[PDB]
Amino acid sequence: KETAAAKFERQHMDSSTSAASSSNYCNQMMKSRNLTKDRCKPVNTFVHESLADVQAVCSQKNVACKXGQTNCYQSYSTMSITDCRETGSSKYPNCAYKTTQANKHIIVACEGNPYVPVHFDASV
Numbered sequence: 001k002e003t004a005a006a007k008f009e010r011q012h013m014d015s016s017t018s019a020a021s022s023s024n025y026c027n028q029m030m031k032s033r034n035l036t037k038d039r040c041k042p043v044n045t046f047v048h049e050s051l052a053d054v055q056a057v058c059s060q061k062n063v064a065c066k067x068g069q070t071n072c073y074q075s076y077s078t079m080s081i082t083d084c085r086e087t088g089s090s091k092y093p094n095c096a097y098k099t100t101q102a103n104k105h106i107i108v109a110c111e112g113n114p115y116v117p118v119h120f121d122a123s124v
Helices: 004-012 026-032 053-058
Strands: 043-047 061-062 072-074 080-087 097-104 104-110 116-123
Touching: 004 043, 004 116, 026 043, 026 080, 026 097, 043 116, 053 072, 053 104, 053 116
Parallel strands: none
Antiparallel strands: 043 080, 061 072, 072 104, 080 097, 104 116
């Protein structure tokens, strides 16, 4: 099973590279992170930072969630992220994605005790 925190890690964390490794990154990672099992998920962001740096965002700038409520927080620093967005010719089960590297402030939803990231809301 996956707690909300654990699912966030699966869907959104990849501390093992400093940035998308190549233009094939999302094509590989959307599959490997189990985001294409039952459908092609259209959009998903990965964060190339330590989990400790991402966790601290839950104490940074409080903002309204895009979806949630107002349990979202925007990072003071920018972070290395990858935007994965389904391409027009994609069709399940052949899910294909544009990989875009970015360096943006992230916005996460946080919950629990301990109070940790559970959703990737947005970037700015």
